[PDB]
Each structure stands twice: as structure tokens, then as C-alpha cells.
């Protein structure tokens with residue numbers, strides 16, 4: 001499904017990218033945070049955790065994750081925690097490994113965000 | 125020996141469902157001649173460890189010795205119950221939140237609001253004498269119930285278990301700035317609870333939900349990191365203003381204890 005959209009549709013891919021740039025900025029701007037590059041600013045897991053709370057209606061206590069991760073291990077933990085929250089929200093377990101997001105596999109970064117946009121379309 | 129087997133889930137009469145949410149569901153029901161609510165906790169990755177923990181954590185909520193504390197009547201262990209479940213007596217007016225913000229029939233007057241404050245302060249003073257404190261007990265208007273005679277009672281069935289939604293906060297507007305950021309073990313829990321009471325005072329004064337226009341994530345992040353606070357309400361009595369301000373001191377060490385403010389609130393009732 002999403003494989004064809006990434007690999008075999010460049011024109012549509014960029015209609016979805018700008019969408020996702022608007023989508024995540026719609027929510028993170030409420031925290032005075034801006035997302036200018038889809039492919040590198042989600043890698044440490046922080047904005048994914050913050051996004052999940054903005055999208056499912058909770059705050060995540062700052063002692064529950066690494067607000068400023070100082071290691072590859074901490075970013076992997078953040079991303080894994082974000083995937084857990086995704087699963088608590090009704091999504092099935094994401095297909096990419098948490099390390100794939102931390103390593104900027106764009107097909108993985110976009111797939112996670114695509115499934116977030118798809119699910120939380122009507123959320124304001 | 126196994127001290128307590130708990131309540132038999134099979135003995136519960138589920139009458140009508142009141143809620144379904146992140147924790148599970150809540151029903152109105154009956155059990156052994158009692159009108160009750162039944163809180164069904166639906167926990168992902170249930171394990172024998174978590175079930176053991178539930179059965180050790182539940183007895184601490186069975187507090188029958190203070191009028192402003194609403195005990196958990198008992199709990200259903202899982203196994204053999206389908207889910208970890210707890211029961212509490214049905215409170216006809218629902219939560220303080222319901223009474224203040226969702227009251228379609230009457231508006232409670234400010235003498236009743238002062239009595240609610242006194243009730244909550246008395247119950248919190250009692251809970252603060254427990255050794256150790258009940259873990260993961262947050263004070264907010266959704267976690268206080270209003271009984272048939274309008275007595276406010278701290279809801280022990282709203283204390284979060286160790287396995288229950290860890291890492292998520294659905295009522296951050298009542299939480300002390302330090303408690304939004306630091307592990308409970310690195311905070312003075314009693315002082316953090318007094319901040320929650322200060323927000324309750326604000327709620328009783330304004331009859332508004334604190335930060336109602338903001339999402340929970342916005343609330344927690346802006347209170348923790350950007351100094352966001354409720355605005356003192358205009359033109360209230362100096363005595364109420366001073367009490368609100370000292371209970372909401374930015375310095376946790378300078379906030380009063382509940383047993384200190386109980387006599388202040390007593391003198392605030394009617395002669």
C-alpha cells in the first residue's frame with residue numbers, strides 16, 4: 001500500500017509531504033515548536049511523543065521520557081515509547097523498527113507520520 | 125495464608141455503563157445490597173506481576189475511618205476476574221467536577237463551596253498522615269465525589285495503580301509545576317498536593333475549569349516550562365486571595381500543610 005506511494009509516485013509523495021509538514025506543525029506550534037524538515041527532526045523521538053499527547057489528549061510527564069536525548073540509546077527509547085503510545089491509541093504495532101526512525105529511513109519516517117495523519121485527521 | 129480473596133466478580137450486578145475511557149470502563153451497579161460503581165481497568169500486557177501488584181496496592185485504598193475519604197469497598201482479583209476491577213459506593217451527585225461544571229439543576233452557593241474546601245482539606249490532612257503516602261494519588265476535581273448530604277470525599281478509586289497509564293497525565297492543570305517534571309521520589313509529595321488544592325480553590329472561586337481553552341499537552345508543557353499559572357480572580361476577598369496565593373507558592377517548601385489550613389477554612393464557614 002504505502003510502498004507503492006513512496007516508491008512509485010513522486011508527484012503524490014510530495015502532495016503528502018507538504019500535508020505532513022502542515023499536520024505536525026498544526027499541533028507542535030501550540031508548544032512554540034516548528035518542524036521545517038520532515039526527514040531529520042523526528043529522529044530523536046521527542047516530537048513524536050509530544051505529538052501523541054497533543055493528538056490523544058494527555059500530557060507526558062517530562063520524567064517519563066528524554067526531553068533532550070543525549071545518546072542513540074535514549075532516542076531509541078523515546079521512539080519505542082512513542083510507538084507504545086501509538087498502540088495505546090488503537091494503531092497496530094508500527095512496521096519500522098524504532099532504530100529506523102532514529103536512522104532517518106524516510107520511507108519509515110513518512111509511514112509512521114502517514115499512519116498518524118490518516119488516523120488523526122479530524123483532530124484540531 | 126492468602127489474607128484476602130477480594131470480591132467475587134460473579135456477584136456484581138452491572139446496571140448501566142457510565143463511561144469508557146483510557147483506563148477502562150465505569151458502570152453503575154449493585155452488589156450485596158449496595159449501590160456501587162464498578163471500575164473495570166483494561167490493562168495491556170497484563171501479567172502475573174501486575175496482578176500481584178494490583179492485589180497488594182488495593183488494600184491501601186480501603187480506608188473506612190474518615191468521613192471525607194471515600195473507600196474502595198473491595199476489588200476483584202484478575203484472575204479469576206476478567207479484568208482487575210474495583211468497586212466503590214455510588215455517590216449521587218457524582219464528582220466535584222460534575223457538580224461545579226456540569227450542574228444543570230442548581231448552582232452550589234459559595235457557602236457550600238467553602239464547605240467543599242474544608243471537607244477536601246480534612247480528607248487530605250488525614251491521607252497525609254499515612255505512612256508511607258498512598259502512591260500515585262492526585263487531587264483534582266474529578267477525583268473528589270459529592271455524597272448525598274453534599275459531603276465532599278476524596279475518591280480512593282481514582283488512585284492510579286503502578287501499571288495504569290504510566291507516563292500519561294489526563295488532568296495536568298491541577299498538578300504542581302515540579303510534579304509535572306520530576307519523578308515523585310524527587311518531589312515533596314505533600315507540598316505538590318497543596319498546589320492541587322490551590323487550583324481547587326481557584327476552581328471554586330471562578331466556577332471555571334482551569335486552562336479550559338488548552339489541551340492537556342499544552343497545559344503540562346506551558347506550566348512546566350513557560351511559567352503558566354491561573355490568574356488570581358479579580359475582586360475577591362483579601363482573605364481568600366491570600367490563602368490561594370500561599371497554597372500556590374512557587375516554592376514547594378513554603379506551601380502550608382493541609383492540617384495548617386483546616387482551621388483557616390473552619391473560620392471561613394458561617395457562625
Ligand SMILES: Nc1ncnc2c1ncn2[C@@H]1O[C@H](COP(=O)(O)OP(=O)(O)OP(=O)(O)O)[C@@H](O)[C@H]1O
Pocket residue numbers: 142143144145146147148149150161212213214215216217218219222266267269281282294
Ligand atoms: N463513586 C461514584 N459515584 C458516582 N459517580 C461516579 C463515582 N466515580 C465516578 N463517578 C462518575 O463516573 C464518571 C466517569 O469517571 P471515570 O473514573 O471513568 O473517568 P475519570 O475519572 O475522568 O478518569 P480515570 O479513569 O482516570 O479515573 C465521572 O465523571 C463521575 O461522573
Ligand SMILES: [Mg+2]
Pocket residue numbers: 281282
Ligand atoms: Mg475515575
